Structures are given as C-alpha cells and as structure tokens.
C-alpha cells in the first residue's frame, strides 16, 4: 500500500542525517580554527600558515558540491511529501541539524576565508619588514664590531713602540682619536636600528654574532683606552721636560737604546750596559755595575726602567732649604718674619696667604707677632 | 795729591761703619794709633767674634793690640805691603792709609767678585755691566773714568731709573754731576760723602784705592735691592705650585665624591632582577635601560677616566716637584673608586639579556592567556547548549518506532560530542603551559579549566546514561 | 711599557650569544575538506 511510497521518505531522511551530521561538525570545526589566534617569530612560520590556508581554500569547491548534494536530498524530501500529500511534521526525526542551519553556517565559513588570508598577509608583511631590520643590524654590527677591535690593537701597538719619539706618538694618537670621533656617527645610527628591533619585539638575529651590548662595552673600552694612552704620552713628556733633558736629546737616547737591544722585548743589559759606559766616561765600572745590579728593581734590568735609571743619577731640583733661606733674606736675616715685612716686599695677593697660613715663631729669639717660616716651608714639602 | 783723597775717603768710610760701632774718628793717623778703633772696625764690617783689645795706656799695650788685629788679617791671608805694626802706633801716615785700604779691599771688594777674578777685576766688571746701555759713560779704570762722575749718576738710574733724570746730565759740568750723585747717595742710599768733588776733578789722576772704596759701598747698597728679586721669584714659584696642586687636590675630592654618589644610586636599580606582571611594564624597563646606556653611562664613563687622568697628572706634578704623594680620603681612594665602578659593571651586563628574556616570556603568556579566554568561552557556550538538550527527559513518552528514531538522533549527539574532545584537550594543554610559565592569574585559569574538565566528565557520563535509557526502551517492546 | 700612577696605586703587576627557551606554538589550522593527507 502506502508503506512502499512512504519508505522512500525514510531512506532519504536517513541519507540526509548520515551526510549532514559529519559535514556540520566539519563546518563547526572550520569556523573556530579559521579565526584562531596565531603568533610567529620566523618567515617559515608565516609561510607554513599561509600554505595551510591555501590548502583549505583548495578543497572549498568540493565542500560546496557536498553542500548542494545534502540540500538536494532535503529538497527531494519536501518534493515527495508535496507530490503525494502525506500529512507529517516535515522535521527529520534523525538529524536535529536543519538545512537552514547548514546554509547559514556555510555563509559564515565563506566570510571568514577572506579575513584569514588578509590577516596572514598582514603578518607576512610584518615578518618581511622585521627581517629587513634583522639584516640592517647585522650589516653595521659585523663592520663596527671588528673596527673597534682594530683601533684597540692599533692603540695597544702605539703604546709599545720601540722607536719612541713622544711628539710623533702624540700626533699618531691624536689621529687615532680623530678616527674614533668620526666613527661615533655610525654607532649612534646603529643604536637607532637596535631600538627599532627591540620595539618590534625581536630577539632573533642569526645573521650576526655581535649583540648591541657587545658594541656598547667595546666602544666604552675603546673610548677609555684612547683617553688613558693619550694621558700616558702627556705624562711621559711632562716628566721628561721636568727632568731637563731636551726633545732631540731624548730621541738620541731612544736611538742609542734601540741599537744596544739584542733582546728587543726587554732591554739588552748585563755586558751591554758595560758597552754603554765604555762609549762615554772612564773605568769606574766595578762599583757602578754592582750598584746598577741592585738598582735593577727595588722590589719584585727593565727597558723603560733603564732609560729612567740613566736619567736618575743626574739629579738637580729645588727644595724647602732653598725657600727657607729666601724667607730669611726677606726678614733681613731673622729666624722669624713679621706680617708687615711679607706685604712690604711680596705682591699683596701672595703676601696674605703667608700671613694666614704661617704659624707662631716661639723660638729662642721670640717676639710678639713673629711668624715661623721654618715650619711653614718645611710643611709645604711634606 | 794721593794723600788728600785717601785721608777723606778712608776716614768717612771708617765713619760709615764706626757710626754703628758707637764711636767716630777725626784724625785717621791719631785715633787708630791705640788700635782700639781698628779692632772695633774689624768687628763691625766682618760681623764676626774678635780677640779682646787691651786699653793701651802703656806703650807696650798699644803695639800688642795692633799685632792682634794684624794676626786676625792672617786668617784672611792678605799680603803685607811696606807695613809695620810699630809704625801704626808711631803714627805713620803713608803706612796707616795703606793698611786701611787692605781692610776695605778684603771685606768690601773680595766678597763682591763672584766671577773668580781677584779684587779690581770683579768690581770693574760690575761697573761695566751696569753702565753698558749708557753712551756718555766710559768705565775702564778706577781713576780717569770716574773723574767725570757722569757714570755714577747712571749707576743710580740702573737700579732706580725713576729716581734720576739721566737725560738732563751731560759732560759740560763734571763737578755738579758728582756733587748731585753723592747727595742722592747720602740722603737716600745711606752712603756718607767720602770723595770731595772739587778735589777729584781738579787733579789729573785720582787715587784708585779711594775711588774703589766709594764704589764698593754703592755695590753693597744695591746688593739687597737686587736680592729682593731672588726672594720674590722663589715665593711666587712655591706659592703658585702649592696653590695649583691644592686646587687640583680639591677637584679630585669633588669629582670623586660626585662620581661615587652617582654609582651609589644606579647600582641598586641595576641589580633588581624582580620581573613585572605585564610585558608593557618590562618593555618600559628596557627603554629606561636603553636611555641609561645611550644618555647616562657615556658621560659617567668620561668622568671616570677624567678622574683617572686628573689623579695621574696630580701625582706626576707632586713627584717632579719633590712634594709628597697625594693621599685621598678613606672612601675616595684609588682602589675604592675602581672597586665601586667594578660593582656597577657586573650588574649592567645581566640586566639587558634578562629584561629581554622576561619580555619574551611575558609576550607568550599575554598571548596564551587571551587565546585560552577565547577557547574557553566558545567551549563554555557549546557545552551549555549540549547540557540542556540532554536534561530534557521527554523520551519516556514514546513507542518503539519513536524510540528507534530517538536512538539515531542521540547517536549524532555522541559523535558530535567526540569531535569536541581535542578542543577540550587544547584548553587543558594551553592552561597547563600558563601554569608552567608562572602566569599571575594561573590560579583562576586553573579554576576555569578545572570546572570545564569536571563538567565535561559529567556531560560524557550523562550522554552514556541517556543511551542506556533509550536502549532499555528499545529492548523492552522487542519482547 | 708605559706605567700609569693609577695602576701602581691600586696594585698593578710590574710584568704582565644567547639561546632563547624554545616554545610549543599552539597555532591551529582549520581542517581542509575531506582528509588531512591531501
């Protein structure tokens, strides 16, 4: 009877339920994973996500075919219940997922696809711009980093020169310092690139081995090394000029030092110092040799030290006994001096420092207001 | 003529040094006879201790004292020329005058010569050196060159140019120029008039011993005026040296404490390795550390190696001037300054790296916490939805036909539930990572995840409890 | 070589790159229609 005509409706309703239910959770799983949150720190990580999205976009025509194939069964159900006018609820007793539900959910999947590729293309652009910053840093750090190392070595070499001239060493150091002052222009520009990288949240640079802190430390080291070594030259000149020896005579001593140097690293000494004594003066080499062997070092013969020990025996300086005698001739040969006397001869500016800092005489030939220049001058020299 | 000039000069020279001694002579050939005035004159011009002169009332006493004074002249060693100790007491005019010149030469002419030339050569050289720029002056001998007396006025311009009008003086009046030069010397330089002008200019050759005596007193007067220069240049030397070294010593203490204090406040900040709750706060910490390394440490690096060059030059200036070494304060020492700068640098190397490694770990937590929030809510709604359709126990009113249809509808509610298995697994996995990474809200993420997992278990058992109810209905009508 | 007053005073001798923790990215990809193998 009607059990044959109505059986086809049941076999259609079960084919719908068995096709629509798995397709529904595919769309439910696609709607969620399509608008999923991502974070990448490599160009390969965005290239893999864009590849996986192109694979999803590729199967969409096949998914639309199954979408129409599932709605074909749904339409054919409403077709045969209209064709044979059999009163029923027209709501699939097996699938609780209506055809309208699968239609609106497909529209949602359709709208998320253009969003996902525009968000992946935005992050690809971010990753491509970030890689440019990574490369920009490695371009300067791998050039500035080793440059600093070279100026460090150049300065370390100029502060260990055998052919020492001091005035030539100062002009060479003033040009190594001038190279540093015109290279800072590149380091402050590198600091700007480092800021652009760390502000882009980038801790990734395989293109370089040098960190910014490696350059920051190296630059401070170089800056404190040029300032240190320039002062060394100024100190050697200030002590040489105070020693009284002339500039040409100093270079002459450095030249005589250089040839009597077979050791090179150290000063050629022992019988070579005897060969310096034979050039000038006569004999006196038995007590003078023994004194130079004791004068090698007071505590634990040196190259620079040899130059200092030759210029040490020639000693002539101005001390306290010279100024105490000069204060006595001021006081007209008195063991004390008056405040009135100090301002009578000395310039008023320099006279007032004495009348204030000079102590009480209190000696054998005592007198009120008598200043003691013997204790004032002997304190100035320790 | 030589005796008239010796008598006036050697008397007023004796008077110039015997005014101090408290006695005066009038007749040089009579007052010196006893030897008392001669032994007193030697005590003053030398300033040394001399033997005791016997009073000389007796004839033998006078000679005994002249021999005492002449025995003192043997310590100097000066040669004796036609001189007798007896003829001094006798009153020999040529002998006494010649002996006075011996005394003037040894004490007022030999100690004058510093160019190792004895007596006249040392005094003449000084007269020629001091009268070199003067064109109208010519000094070659101590007699005809002194006779004009225009070079004596030039000598007073050589040390006091402000006191004399050199321009007015000419050779037309030798008498008046000599008179004027002796009045200036007597009224200001305290050199009494020993040479008479009228007598010298008339005579063709004046006595060299008398002229040399007058010049020696002029040299002696200007010896202390030029000695003031030695005293001024040495006091200016040691005062400028001690004032500069003391100023530079005060700048070391000033710069050492200023640097020491900046290191004191930037050391705790640099060694605070306690991270913040948000990546925004730590990224802020990185920018203020970036400002420190770009605009705060670089000048303090210059002031550290400026303190080194300043201390270096300070110890050199003291060493080259024989002054003792500079000793800084207990806290502002060399080892204390380098020691504090060493403490500062260790803290700054870790601080960079650490800050990034905190920023990155926060970056992940900030993302995974938001992702979890999003996945938890989309599941919470889905789970609530499926929970209610199972709570509707409307299946008890059904026939075997409706029951078998309801079983295939519940079969779909089972397979679709199993699809959301890895969704719940993902929620549990990303909450586990927030707990392992010490997220600040990992106590409330664990509650939201535990409640979701405890409900998912009940959802699953309730799913299988309703299948068993439908199966109990299908196998009921079957029999 | 050339001694410094600063070095002798403090006690000078007279004669002489970060591996980051790796992370399990929880990035998810939507299932393409059919299977995952294609």
PDB file of C-alpha atoms in Angstrom, chain B residues 78 105-106 109-124 212:
ATOM      1  CA  UNK B  78     146.097  89.208  52.600  1.00  0.00           C
ATOM      2  CA  UNK B 105     139.687  95.566  49.885  1.00  0.00           C
ATOM      3  CA  UNK B 106     139.361  92.260  51.803  1.00  0.00           C
ATOM      4  CA  UNK B 109     135.844  94.230  47.461  1.00  0.00           C
ATOM      5  CA  UNK B 110     136.822  90.482  47.516  1.00  0.00           C
ATOM      6  CA  UNK B 111     133.451  89.085  48.735  1.00  0.00           C
ATOM      7  CA  UNK B 112     131.963  91.231  45.833  1.00  0.00           C
ATOM      8  CA  UNK B 113     133.683  89.282  42.997  1.00  0.00           C
ATOM      9  CA  UNK B 114     131.655  86.183  42.021  1.00  0.00           C
ATOM     10  CA  UNK B 115     133.461  85.739  38.596  1.00  0.00           C
ATOM     11  CA  UNK B 116     136.603  84.212  40.327  1.00  0.00           C
ATOM     12  CA  UNK B 117     138.703  87.336  39.391  1.00  0.00           C
ATOM     13  CA  UNK B 118     140.570  88.832  42.397  1.00  0.00           C
ATOM     14  CA  UNK B 119     139.784  92.327  43.800  1.00  0.00           C
ATOM     15  CA  UNK B 120     139.590  95.136  40.908  1.00  0.00           C
ATOM     16  CA  UNK B 121     138.562  92.761  38.075  1.00  0.00           C
ATOM     17  CA  UNK B 122     135.382  91.662  39.851  1.00  0.00           C
ATOM     18  CA  UNK B 123     134.397  95.232  40.737  1.00  0.00           C
ATOM     19  CA  UNK B 124     135.259  96.712  37.316  1.00  0.00           C
ATOM     20  CA  UNK B 212     137.181 101.806  44.539  1.00  0.00           C
TER      21      UNK B 212
END
